[PDB]
Amino acid sequence: SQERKNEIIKEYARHEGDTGSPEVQIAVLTEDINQLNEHARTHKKDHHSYRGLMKKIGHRRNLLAYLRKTDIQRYRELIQRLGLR
Amino acid sequence: VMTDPIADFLTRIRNANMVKHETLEVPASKIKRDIAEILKREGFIRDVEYIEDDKQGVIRVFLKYGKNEERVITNLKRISKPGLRAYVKADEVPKVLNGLGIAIISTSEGVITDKEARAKNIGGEVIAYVW
Amino acid sequence: VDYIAANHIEYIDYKDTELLKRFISERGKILPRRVTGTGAKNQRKLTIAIKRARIMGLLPFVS
Amino acid sequence: DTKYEIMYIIRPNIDEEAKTALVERFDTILKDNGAEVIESKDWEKRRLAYEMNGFREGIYHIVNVTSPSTAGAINEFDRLAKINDDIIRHMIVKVE
Amino acid sequence: YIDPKHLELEDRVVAINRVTKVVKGGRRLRFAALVVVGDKNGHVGFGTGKAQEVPEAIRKAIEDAKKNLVEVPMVGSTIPHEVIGVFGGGRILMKPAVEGSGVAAGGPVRAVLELAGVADITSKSLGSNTPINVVRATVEGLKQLKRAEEVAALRGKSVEEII
RNA sequence: GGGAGACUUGAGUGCAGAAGAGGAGAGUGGAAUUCCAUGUGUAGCGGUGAAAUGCGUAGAUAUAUGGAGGAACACCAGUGGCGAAGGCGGCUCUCUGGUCUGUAACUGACGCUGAGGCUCGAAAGCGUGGGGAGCAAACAGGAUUAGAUACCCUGGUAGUCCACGCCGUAAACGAUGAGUGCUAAGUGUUGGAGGGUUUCCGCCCUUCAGUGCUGCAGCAAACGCAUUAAGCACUCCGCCUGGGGA
Ligand SMILES: CN[C@@H]1[C@H](O)[C@H](NC)[C@H]2O[C@@]3(O)C(=O)C[C@@H](C)O[C@H]3O[C@@H]2[C@H]1O
Ligand SMILES: [K+]
Ligand SMILES: [K+]
Ligand SMILES: [K+]
Ligand SMILES: [K+]
Ligand SMILES: [K+]
Ligand SMILES: [Mg+2]
Ligand SMILES: [Mg+2]
Ligand SMILES: [Mg+2]
Ligand SMILES: [Mg+2]
C-alpha cells in the first residue's frame, strides 16, 4: 500500500520531506519484508517472489551496514525502533 | 562500475586516436589534468581545455595528427593498476622506446615525465606509458 | 490500416460483438495482426477480448 | 477500491418475477459481503453463439460493482452463481 | 613504395616447402619457396613463389619480394628501439643490442635482419615457427620501428627535447 | 592507505507513468481422443514397402444423440514478451516479484565482484497417497532378417498428471561469468518519453531500454565477432596446462 508506505516514511523521516535516507529505506524495506514473509508462509512454492524477498533482505542489510559504519548511534536507535537484531 | 578512471581515460584517448576522432571528452580529476597537461607540453596532443560543470568538471582533449593524418600517439598503456600497484626506485625509472616515448610518473614532486624524474633522481608510481 | 487507431478507441470491451467480428475470420478463427493491419498492443487486447467473448457465447468458438 | 464488471446469463425460460427475485437475491449477496453495486442492469437478450446447458438463448445481465480487492464478495458471488441453476454462465472482470 | 631499381639487391632462400594438391589420379607435387631480398643498407622484402620446379619457384618469389621491398629505420649497427611484431600465430620480439653483439636471432629472422643490414640485435620468436608467419611478423615489427627525427617532427619538439 | 569534512554524476528512495505465457492459490471454457448408453446399418475395420497379429455376425468400423473422465490449450503466435537460470502460451479472480521510461524532491559512494555457505534448478528417477484419456520404456504377439534381444505393425504396465518430500544431473548452449566505460554506420521489431506536423489517424524527427539482420574500425588459426564484441580498457570470481587411464 502506497499510503502505508507514505505514513511509514513520514514517521521515520530524518526531517521533513526526506524520502530517501538509510532509516526511511530500512523501515520501508522491513515492512515489505514482513508482509512478504506472510505471503511466502502462505505460498511456500512461490519461489520467484521469494527471490524478490531475498533481494530486499540483502539490500536492507547493506543499508544497515552503511548506517552502522556512518552513525552507530542512529544504527542502534533504528534497530530499537524496528525491533531488529 | 568504474575502478580505474585513469585507465579509462587512457583507453578513451586510444580509441579516439584509433578512429582519428578530432576531440574527446572525459570526466575531470586532478590526476587526469596532470596527465593531460603532460601530454600537452610533450606534444602528444594538440590542446587541452577544461569545462566547468556541477558534478566534477569535464576535460576535453584535442588529438594531434601530423601531415598525412599520421597518428602522433602510437599507443598508451596503464602500468600501475588497482589490482597491482607499480612503484619504481630512482634507478628503476623506465625509458619508453629508448626515450622516444614517455612514462608518466607520480612522485613527491607531482606527476612528471620519466626524463624529469630521473633528472631529479627520484622514483614514484609509474602511472602510464605513452609513445 | 490499424482500425483501432483509426477509430481512436483505447478500451476494447469484450461485449462489442460488432467490433470483434471484424477481427475474426470465418469459422471464428482470429486473424493475424499483419493481415488486419493492427498493432501489437491492440492485437493483444483484441485477443483477450475475443477469447472472453467466445467463453461468454457472444462469439462462436468454431464455425 | 477495485472496479469489477459482472455479466451473467439467465436462462430464457425464467419468468419475469423469478428473474427479478434472482437479480434481487444476488444484489443482496454482493451488498452483504461488502461490494457496492454502482449499477445493475439487464444488458440484452441474445441468442447464444453455441448451445450452453442445452439452451440456444439467454438473457445477459450486467452488474458493475466496486469493492476492496481483499473483500470476498466476488468470491461468494461466484460460488453462489455456480450453485444456482437459473444462471447459465457468468464472467467477472476487473475494469479500469 | 620502394623502387627496386637503383638498389643492389641480394636474395636468400628462407625455406622451400613441398606442397601437394590431391587430384583424381593421385598427388600433384609443387614447391612453394619463401625468399627474402634485401640491400644490406635498410631495404628488405620477402616474396613467395609456387612452381613445379624449385628454381622457378625461387625466381617467382624473388620477383614478388622485389615488388614488396620495404625500408627499415636503423640506428648505428642496430634498430632504434625494442619492438614486438605479430602476424597470425607468428610473434617476434626484437631489441637493440650493443655494438659487436651480432644478430642473436633464429633462422628466418636472421635472414630478414641480415639482408636489411642490421648487424647487432637480439631476437626471440615467442609464437609459432612457421617460416612464412615469422617472416611476416618480423616485417610488422620493423615497420613499427620509428625514427627519432620523424618522432620529433611529429611531436613538434627538437630531437634533444624528445630525448 | 588512515583520520576529519564537503559534493552528486554511481547506487538506492520518493513522486508520475508503461508492458508483460513472471511466480503461487482457487475456479472455470470450447475443441479433440478414448470409454460408456441407445438409435440407424451390414461385413468388414485397422495396418504395411508388402503382409500378418488385432478388432468385427456376442453386429464392428461408420453414423446420430447424449453421458463419463484425464491431459493439453488450434486460430492470435511474431529471431514477439516475461523470467537470474530451469522455464512460462485458454479464460476469470486473490496474493505476490522484478523490469523499463519520465521528474530531479530525497540519502550522499551507501558500490562491483564474491571463495566457503544458502536458495532455485528441464527431463528421467525415488518415497507416500490419489489420478490415469492419450501417449508410452519394459513386456506380449505379428512381421523383416542369415540372425533382429531393433527399426515397422497390433496391444501394452511403470511413467507421463495431481499433493507433499527426496534427487540436484543435461549439447542446464549464445558450447561466449559478472560490473563499468569507450569505439563507423544501415535497416526491421517490442515498450516508453519528448518535439513538428497532423483536425484526429498518421507521418517525420529526437531519445531511453530490449530484440533481430547487415556491416566499418579492430580482433581472429580460420570459421567468423563487430555498441546484444569474440574490439579498446579496468575490478572481482570460476576454470585450463598432451591423449588415454578417468
Ligand atoms: C572418363 N574419362 C576420364 C575423365 O575424362 C577424367 N577427367 C575428368 C580424366 O582425368 C584424368 O585426366 C585425370 O586427370 C585423372 C586420371 C586418373 O585419369 C585421367 O583420365 C581421366 C579420363 O579417363
Ligand atoms: K451456474
Ligand atoms: K505486476
Ligand atoms: K511416482
Ligand atoms: K534450454
Ligand atoms: K599422461
Ligand atoms: Mg517429473
Ligand atoms: Mg510401439
Ligand atoms: Mg555438468
Ligand atoms: Mg538496440
mmCIF file with all atom_site columns, N, CA and C (backbone and C1' of nucleotides) and ligand atoms in Angstrom, chain F residues 86-87 170 172-173, ligand 5:
data_model
loop_
_atom_site.group_PDB
_atom_site.id
_atom_site.type_symbol
_atom_site.label_atom_id
_atom_site.label_alt_id
_atom_site.label_comp_id
_atom_site.label_asym_id
_atom_site.label_entity_id
_atom_site.label_seq_id
_atom_site.pdbx_PDB_ins_code
_atom_site.Cartn_x
_atom_site.Cartn_y
_atom_site.Cartn_z
_atom_site.occupancy
_atom_site.B_iso_or_equiv
_atom_site.pdbx_formal_charge
_atom_site.auth_seq_id
_atom_site.auth_comp_id
_atom_site.auth_asym_id
_atom_site.auth_atom_id
_atom_site.pdbx_PDB_model_num
ATOM   1  P P     . G F 1 86  ? 17.055 -20.802 -19.298 1.00 0.00 ? 86  G F P     1
ATOM   2  O "O5'" . G F 1 86  ? 16.466 -22.098 -18.588 1.00 0.00 ? 86  G F "O5'" 1
ATOM   3  C "C5'" . G F 1 86  ? 17.228 -23.291 -18.509 1.00 0.00 ? 86  G F "C5'" 1
ATOM   4  C "C4'" . G F 1 86  ? 16.674 -24.236 -17.474 1.00 0.00 ? 86  G F "C4'" 1
ATOM   5  C "C3'" . G F 1 86  ? 15.257 -24.726 -17.711 1.00 0.00 ? 86  G F "C3'" 1
ATOM   6  O "O3'" . G F 1 86  ? 15.184 -25.783 -18.651 1.00 0.00 ? 86  G F "O3'" 1
ATOM   7  C "C1'" . G F 1 86  ? 15.484 -24.048 -15.464 1.00 0.00 ? 86  G F "C1'" 1
ATOM   8  P P     . G F 1 87  ? 14.177 -25.689 -19.898 1.00 0.00 ? 87  G F P     1
ATOM   9  O "O5'" . G F 1 87  ? 12.943 -24.852 -19.340 1.00 0.00 ? 87  G F "O5'" 1
ATOM   10 C "C5'" . G F 1 87  ? 12.042 -25.430 -18.411 1.00 0.00 ? 87  G F "C5'" 1
ATOM   11 C "C4'" . G F 1 87  ? 11.215 -24.385 -17.703 1.00 0.00 ? 87  G F "C4'" 1
ATOM   12 C "C3'" . G F 1 87  ? 9.936  -23.960 -18.404 1.00 0.00 ? 87  G F "C3'" 1
ATOM   13 O "O3'" . G F 1 87  ? 8.861  -24.854 -18.173 1.00 0.00 ? 87  G F "O3'" 1
ATOM   14 C "C1'" . G F 1 87  ? 11.118 -22.044 -17.677 1.00 0.00 ? 87  G F "C1'" 1
ATOM   15 P P     . A F 1 170 ? 25.997 -33.031 -15.488 1.00 0.00 ? 170 A F P     1
ATOM   16 O "O5'" . A F 1 170 ? 24.789 -33.027 -16.525 1.00 0.00 ? 170 A F "O5'" 1
ATOM   17 C "C5'" . A F 1 170 ? 24.728 -32.048 -17.546 1.00 0.00 ? 170 A F "C5'" 1
ATOM   18 C "C4'" . A F 1 170 ? 23.800 -32.456 -18.659 1.00 0.00 ? 170 A F "C4'" 1
ATOM   19 C "C3'" . A F 1 170 ? 23.597 -31.422 -19.752 1.00 0.00 ? 170 A F "C3'" 1
ATOM   20 O "O3'" . A F 1 170 ? 24.646 -31.420 -20.701 1.00 0.00 ? 170 A F "O3'" 1
ATOM   21 C "C1'" . A F 1 170 ? 21.501 -32.248 -19.069 1.00 0.00 ? 170 A F "C1'" 1
ATOM   22 P P     . A F 1 172 ? 21.546 -28.635 -23.279 1.00 0.00 ? 172 A F P     1
ATOM   23 O "O5'" . A F 1 172 ? 21.942 -28.571 -21.738 1.00 0.00 ? 172 A F "O5'" 1
ATOM   24 C "C5'" . A F 1 172 ? 22.666 -27.470 -21.214 1.00 0.00 ? 172 A F "C5'" 1
ATOM   25 C "C4'" . A F 1 172 ? 21.831 -26.670 -20.248 1.00 0.00 ? 172 A F "C4'" 1
ATOM   26 C "C3'" . A F 1 172 ? 22.557 -25.573 -19.485 1.00 0.00 ? 172 A F "C3'" 1
ATOM   27 O "O3'" . A F 1 172 ? 22.707 -24.383 -20.238 1.00 0.00 ? 172 A F "O3'" 1
ATOM   28 C "C1'" . A F 1 172 ? 21.245 -26.840 -17.984 1.00 0.00 ? 172 A F "C1'" 1
ATOM   29 P P     . C F 1 173 ? 24.115 -23.609 -20.267 1.00 0.00 ? 173 C F P     1
ATOM   30 O "O5'" . C F 1 173 ? 24.307 -23.226 -21.799 1.00 0.00 ? 173 C F "O5'" 1
ATOM   31 C "C5'" . C F 1 173 ? 23.974 -21.930 -22.281 1.00 0.00 ? 173 C F "C5'" 1
ATOM   32 C "C4'" . C F 1 173 ? 23.731 -21.940 -23.769 1.00 0.00 ? 173 C F "C4'" 1
ATOM   33 C "C3'" . C F 1 173 ? 22.429 -22.609 -24.199 1.00 0.00 ? 173 C F "C3'" 1
ATOM   34 O "O3'" . C F 1 173 ? 21.925 -21.971 -25.372 1.00 0.00 ? 173 C F "O3'" 1
ATOM   35 C "C1'" . C F 1 173 ? 24.251 -23.772 -25.137 1.00 0.00 ? 173 C F "C1'" 1
HETATM 36 K K     . K G 2 .   ? 17.452 -24.781 -22.542 1.00 0.00 ? 5   K G K     1
#
